[PDB]
Subunit: 450 residues, 2 copies
């Protein structure tokens, strides 16, 4: 009656599966190559700005108050340039980028590469070289999605498959070249950024080609540089997995509160300046200079956060130092991302989770020594646990931490901590962060139509 109707359609569909068009495969190769080159150039510009920042710091190493003022000024002017470019030329090129390029894969949120690529590139360059605690993945994944749309519009590809596949392969190429992590890009685009409530024709065989050419363009210009080089930690036996479940419960209790904090401060800071261009640029300059001066006095609360994950997994931190770094780092990340700067929050979540993981593993190693514990395996497990409770994408959290730490023997602690985080963030009332920001800006856009 109806099964006869669907069975012939299912046979006709299964006998020709996985036939994507060669036009889309070739444009996905060009998209992935351009996104890898743009991410390499963005990384080199950020590092050259930070090196010139440190050189201007050491240029006058005789007067301490003058050094603190020149640190504040040289970071604040770069932050003012980034906030001005974003706030004057492109109101949708500030923040993370993953909501504004995830809403573009659901046929809303128009991607405008001509007024995103230079402004998000140069503004994220300014506010990331200034020292503000932001991840260089969000600026490169919105650059990735917009390079995908730019190739689609230049070569005049038609169809509804080509647009979604090129936005997805641009975004996955951006996440692959930000972290040197090829598998995390595909597992981020088929688990988090595709439309979760309907059916779209994203071709994984083209997302893969974008990720391959992007990671090859990363490895051409980044030879023998590991982003995170932890050693080779001891394995976790079967009588120790309950501790990683407890750590997952702690991250799942913490995650939704971090979501509520970032969504609350991102309009508590709007209550300061009201939306004005000059007052927004002045407030952004104040917080960028504050994070730049924290880049000199106590130089662990600022920065991207990737220069303390190799420290906080081999010991080398006091408990008081861990609590001070966690408190001031959560303060500075909630101040820097939620103000409106161009910069993601993946990297100060992978750095904010390792501090909490070391602070739990250092408790657990002394609470009972009958297991012969180490305070580093709990940090490796808890790295992608705030990334699994806050943004609630545990599969790409676990895959990305397995990519950039290369400790496979902790895969069962990693999956148990990330999954306890996801479950206890669900049973607390924690909506995912990248969907909450997207739904918030869509409701704001709808209220601005009346």
């Amino acid at each position: 009656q109806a099964a006869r109707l669907r069975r012939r359609q299912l046979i006709r569909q299964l006998l020709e599966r996985d036939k994507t068009p060669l036009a889309i495969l070739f444009m996905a190769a060009v998209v992935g190559t351009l996104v890898g080159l743009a991410a390499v150039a963005f990384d080199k510009g950020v590092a050259w700005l930070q090196n010139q920042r440190m050189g201007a710091l050491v240029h006058t190493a005789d007067n301490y108050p003058l050094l603190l003022t020149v640190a504040f000024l040289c970071s604040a002017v770069l932050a003012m340039f980034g906030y001005f470019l974003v706030r004057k030329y492109a109101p949708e090129a500030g923040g993370s980028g993953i909501p504004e390029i995830e809403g573009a894969l659901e046929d809303q949120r128009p991607v405008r590469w001509w007024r995103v690529l230079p402004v998000k590139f140069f503004g994220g360059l300014g506010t990331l070289g200034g020292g503000m605690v932001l991840g260089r993945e969000g600026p490169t994944v919105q650059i990735g999605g917009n390079i995908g749309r730019m190739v689609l519009d230049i070569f005049r590809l038609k169809g509804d498959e080509a647009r979604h596949t090129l936005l997805a392969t641009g975004a996955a190429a951006g996440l692959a070249a930000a972290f040197n992590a090829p598998l995390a890009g595909i597992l981020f685009i088929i688990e988090e950024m595709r439309p979760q409530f309907r059916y779209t024709l994203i071709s994984i065989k083209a997302v893969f080609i974008g990720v391959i050419m992007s990671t090859i363009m990363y490895r051409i210009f980044n030879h023998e540089v590991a982003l995170i080089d932890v050693g080779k930690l001891s394995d976790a036996p079967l009588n120790t997995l309950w501790l990683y479940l407890i750590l997952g419960i702690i991250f799942g209790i913490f995650g939704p509160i971090f979501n509520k904090w970032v969504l609350g401060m991102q309009d508590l800071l709007h209550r300061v300046h009201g939306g004005n261009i000059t007052k927004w640029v002045l407030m952004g300059g104040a917080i960028g200079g504050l994070c730049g001066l924290l880049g000199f006095v106590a130089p662990a609360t600022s920065g991207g956060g990737f220069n303390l994950i190799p420290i906080a997994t081999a010991g080398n931190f006091s408990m008081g130092m861990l609590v001070f770094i966690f408190v001031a780092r959560v303060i500075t990340t909630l101040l820097c991302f939620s103000s409106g700067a161009p910069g993601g929050i993946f990297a100060p979540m992978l750095a904010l989770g390792t501090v909490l993981g070391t602070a739990f593993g250092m408790v657990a190693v002394e609470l009972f020594p009958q297991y012969h514990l180490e305070a580093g395996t709990f940090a490796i497990a808890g790295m992608g646990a705030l990334l699994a409770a806050s943004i609630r994408a545990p599969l790409t959290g676990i895959i990305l931490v397995l990519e950039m730490t290369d400790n496979y023997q902790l895969i069962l602690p990693m999956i148990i901590t990330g999954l306890g985080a996801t479950l206890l963030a669900q049973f607390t009332g924690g909506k995912p962060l990248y969907s909450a920001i997207l739904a918030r800006t869509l409701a704001k856009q709808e209220a601005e139509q009346l």
Copy 2:
């Protein structure tokens, strides 16, 4: 314009994203535990039958003709029992079973647990203890899906989300417990064994809990036992990725030829018995006896295929022995799987991929000594490449070879070989194997049945 209605439903759906019922999450925990226990009991039964079958020979080791006849009888009676149980009490238990579960996720080909579970269990036990070239993976993916449907019908869960989610977590727990690969168990569901043409409601968190509990129930019972133990090989520089591209092109133009072979041999052996029960069990007994005789004399062409996979990865295989193993393994895999025995092909395609990759690696390292190559890196890159060109599931092929070889430094040769394989299997024009078997057994059920 209906885009405003799509926006309003999108806001209401993004706020309520990833919120799975607690009943589904608990029942997927129970599915994971039961499929872990079923795969552990299945592996121990196959191990004990292989031990007794190969130990009775040296127990009664008088003379060589009697030794060969007792090898043939000791394998052929077990294979006769498996074929008879399949073709008498559950005809869907024949073959791999990933097509039957891949159909039952689309509300066709109904999973009768009370007929498949004991027949796939004991029949796969007989035909896999008989030393046949059959995977341990198929008869535990289908046992996993049937356990999932069993406990859904036991606890009486209604809805459409519960059925797809418990069948998907059963198949995921089966593939996680067959290979000790937790990540590939989820990655087979989210990109190969879901409904690939319409939206369905498989919650990834329940598949995650099922995979975790299944891998814990594996690792309790055979800890410190890895299936594939290769050493830390040499890394692959950037000027030698085009070699892995050429190896991917070789696998891609071999994939559809092997699919044509298995889908043709599955009728060429059907003409031998004509659907008759007596001639089918007699032909299957001759096949299983041949696979036991080959498992006794020249043993590295029979059995599951994980025994020779660390020898081929940089071991004592010559170019004259690798060709013999490849031709005899493809002839025995075809003759043993296309005849309808209960046993998957997903596990003896890893061995064929490793043999072809080792042959290419030994040609390449002799063809130029300027790159300082190795055959072992080509074997680990080409392991899950016939699995990416034949069943055309590249992401889970790459994930699974990353899982059970513990070499992340070859992730770029792995992805390049897998993508060369999928591309040059698509341009040649081969369908995926596990969908071109389901399309065949759906066209048969439509036309040749009613």
